Amino acid sequence: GSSGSSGASSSFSVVSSSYPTGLTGGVTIFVALYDYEARTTEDLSFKKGERFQIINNTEGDWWEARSIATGKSGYIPSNYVVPADSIQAEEWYFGKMGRKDAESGPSSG
């Protein structure tokens, strides 16, 4: 389905929007391992290394989530995104940590 190789020669400086704390509800964290492109307004535009709040996960085909960074919302294929808890391809983070900060704080039991 229009599968090729991404390559958008462009670099935009965007402020790092930290994630919201004190989360309470029926939402699950998911990360995009492969860079996808929202085909239609209904679909959600996500990239490799982007998080999204799973709002509805009734149909495996496509799940409705709301990006936490940009704040977008649509539908993303569960065959491309995986839960940071059951990371089936953790290998990405295991070897390619990409970008992240160290969890400093021994206090937290």
TrEMBL record:
Signal sequence annotation: none
Membrane-spanning segments: none
Subcellular localization: Cell membrane; Cytoplasm, Cytoskeleton; Cytoplasm, Cytosol
Positions of the SH3 domain: 25-86
Similarity field: Belongs to the protein kinase superfamily. Tyr protein kinase family.
Protein name: Tyrosine-protein kinase
UniProt source species: Mus musculus (Mouse)
Recorded name of the encoding gene: Yes1
Stretch of the intact protein here: 72 to 167 of 541
